[PDB]
């Protein structure tokens, strides 16, 4: 890894849970390759021989742990372990039938979310396939929810090798889109033709983008579509690429501004010296996010709190 690049920086005490995320990443196929480095020098490569086989993914995870466990557990001052992680969140699968069913339930907990409401004379919504005896659109029986559009469950050919993979199967909808009492025939609802598999895809399902309706035209609508699985990265970094993990021999200082006692920004400056650019880049990303809603990898919503990360040069004198 290279200092300053995008990636996770784990402190020594949490080396085990971080390595567990990489092991889970190798097991679940999020990770195609991990290049390991002790300090600045490359010492080993971890990569499943065939991603299709379980044993090869487990072998890769065990070797990863064995390689880095003494180096990490006995990590001295100034020492570190870098993992360059070739990943593809799109290839991530669920290797445990219990965890796969946990994702199927995540999806099934959406079944009752309304995507399109029943139509009215005032508001566009769901109308019937056939018009009444006078040639006017009549409201539909039920609202369009997620249970309508797609069913969930683990794939038929699922196994620990191929993975249990929650699979969505597009449904069928006879109901259309329009206003009640209108003479124009209802518009056909386009169901998901892509993103039909969710392997826990090195991601978490983005429910704002997954199974969401896209009406084109509104007051005069011309097309309606429903997206399949659209994920969000568990890190804001892209669905494919490479991330750096680096373990360091540093103490974790969690600074919660809502806390009763936390390091005041004055006493934090008094205890450590910080890189000016590290602060200013984080600050610019915060200002942009505050004023306009602009998201950045530098500042992120994690556990109901906006967070920034700083690695100070060292302690301050006196």
């Amino acid at each position: 890894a290279t200092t300053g690049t995008q990636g996770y920086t784990v402190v020594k005490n949490d080396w085990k849970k971080a390595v567990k995320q990489l092991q889970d990443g190798l097991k679940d196929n999020s990770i195609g390759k991990i290049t390991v480095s002790f300090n600045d020098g490359v010492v080993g490569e971890v990569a499943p021989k065939s991603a299709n086989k379980k044993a090869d993914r487990d072998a890769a995870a065990e070797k990863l742990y064995n390689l880095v466990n003494t180096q990490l557990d006995k990590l001295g001052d100034g020492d570190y372990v870098d993992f360059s992680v070739d990943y593809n969140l799109e290839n991530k699968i669920i290797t445990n039938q219990a965890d796969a069913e946990a994702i199927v339930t995540k999806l099934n907990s959406l079944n009752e979310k309304t995507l399109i409401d029943i139509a009215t004379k005032d508001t566009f919504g769901m109308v019937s396939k056939t018009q009444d005896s006078e040639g006017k659109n009549v409201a539909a029986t039920k609202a369009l929810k997620v249970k309508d559009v797609a069913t969930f469950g683990l794939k038929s050919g699922g196994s620990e090798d191929t993975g249990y993979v929650v699979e969505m199967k597009a449904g069928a909808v006879e109901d259309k889109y329009g206003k009640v009492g209108d003479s124009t025939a209802g518009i056909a609802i386009n169901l998901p033709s892509t993103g039909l598999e969710y392997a826990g895809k090195g991601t978490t399902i983005d429910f704002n983008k997954t199974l969401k309706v896209d009406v084109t035209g509104g007051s005069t609508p011309s097309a309606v579509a429903v997206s399949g699985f659209v994920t969000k990265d568990d890190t804001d970094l892209a669905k494919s690429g490479t991330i750096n993990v680096r373990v360091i021999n540093a103490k974790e200082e969690s600074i919660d501004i809502d806390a009763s006692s936390y390091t005041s920004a004055e006493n934090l400056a008094k205890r450590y010296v910080f890189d000016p650019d590290e602060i200013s880049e984080a600050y610019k990303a915060i200002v942009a996010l505050q004023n306009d809603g602009i998201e950045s990898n530098l500042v992120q919503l994690v556990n109901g709190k906006y967070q920034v990360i700083f690695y100070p040069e060292g302690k301050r004198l006196e």
């Binding site: 402190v11 085990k16 969690s254 806390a259 009763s260």
Partner: protein, 373 residues
């Protein structure tokens, strides 16, 4: 219209009745008295030291059905017999390391304890003491003196002391040895002796192989220690005890450090907090807890909770249904009574282990009633 009997049978019992209902009832009572005459065991010696030895001989390097291990052990956890404070969080250590938790006098290693150490670890002249034979002293020099540590070293054993200046640093030394690998930890107050004993069985539950660590924090301080913060990292924490044991200030402190909202299991007193540990779903499932331990509560004297300390590792690993420890010297609280009633299935309990001597008979009788024994 009859079965072929065993040759060693002392009698042919032919049970006859004119009314099939009277037969049914007789055979039902017979079934009940036959099955019920067997599972309420006391584990106690004349001293607290002997009680811990009795626990070690029954649960470690033992053929007993609820033994934690059947083979010779490689690890001992030793605690000062008077100092409950120092060895307070040692139960999950004893659980994960597969080790008996023994008590020793501060100045002289008791001959009975020495004998149990040699017995449980299988120490001999003809066999090499490889680098794996270990004795963990859970406590400082005012709990287990240097004289005792040197007597264990003189035998030829590796002796590691998990200690600090106080109960807090001592607890982290012990919790560090346990390791925080499930992204989960327990926290108790400095004076929450009974609370640490209430959760000790739970911490001692191995979950995906590992025990869960317990950390003692200064419950009346404004913030927990940097060591506690560092050790806890980014893990889920469950606080045991009320605001008088671990203040709201300390709960927030843990929240701020971990970034995760800590849970709190507590009541108005120690017996209520014990009841609450049983009521908590993560630790025990309603209508599925059949195994139970009973120990003194420390109301008459705080140091008498060492029996629970030594019993907790065992309770945590007991069979495949973990057991709680009910804390009660002279009487069960109304909360303990309710908790056991809701924890036990409609069918009742299957094992009851009394730990130590000075537990009143009322307590045991009451536990047997609640468990239908």
């Amino acid at each position: 219209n009859d079965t072929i009997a065993s040759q060693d049978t002392p009698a042919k019992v032919v049970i006859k009745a004119n009314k099939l209902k009277d037969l049914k009832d007789y055979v039902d009572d017979l079934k009940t008295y036959n099955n019920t005459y067997s599972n309420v065991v006391t584990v106690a010696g004349e001293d607290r030291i002997e009680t811990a030895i009795e626990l070690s001989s029954k649960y470690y390097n033992s053929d007993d059905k609820n033994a934690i291990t059947d083979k010779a052990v490689n690890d001992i956890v030793l605690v000062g017999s008077t100092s409950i404070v120092d060895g307070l969080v040692a139960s999950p250590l004893a659980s994960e390391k597969t080790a008996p938790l023994l008590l020793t006098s501060k100045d002289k290693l008791d001959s009975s304890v020495k004998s149990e150490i040699k017995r449980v670890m299988n120490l001999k002249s003809d066999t090499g003491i490889n680098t794996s034979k270990k004795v963990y002293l859970a406590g400082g020099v005012n709990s287990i003196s240097k004289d005792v540590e040197n007597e264990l070293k003189n035998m030829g054993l590796k002796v590691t002391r998990l200690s600090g200046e106080d109960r807090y640093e001592t607890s982290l030394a012990i919790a560090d040895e346990i390791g925080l690998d499930n992204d989960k930890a327990f926290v108790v107050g400095g004076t929450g002796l009974a609370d640490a004993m209430s959760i000790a069985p739970v911490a001692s539950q191995l979950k995906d192989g590992d025990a869960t660590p317990i950390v003692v924090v200064d419950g009346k301080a404004k913030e927990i220690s940097d060591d506690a913060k560092s050790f806890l990292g980014t893990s889920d924490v469950d606080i045991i005890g009320g605001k008088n044991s671990v203040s709201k200030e300390i709960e927030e402190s843990i929240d701020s450090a971990t970034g995760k909202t800590p849970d709190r299991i507590s009541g108005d007193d120690r017996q209520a907090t014990n009841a609450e540990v049983l009521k908590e779903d993560d630790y025990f499932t309603d209508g599925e807890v059949v195994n139970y331990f009973v120990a003194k509560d420390g109301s008459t004297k705080e140091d008498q909770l060492v029996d629970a300390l030594a019993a907790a590792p065992i309770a945590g690993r007991f069979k495949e249904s973990p057991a709680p420890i009910i804390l009660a010297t002279d009487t069960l609280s109304s909360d303990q009574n309710v908790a056991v009633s809701k924890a036990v299935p409609k069918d009742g309990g299957t094992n009851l282990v009394q730990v130590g001597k000075g537990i009143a008979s009322s307590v045991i009788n009451k536990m047997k009633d609640l468990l239908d024994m």
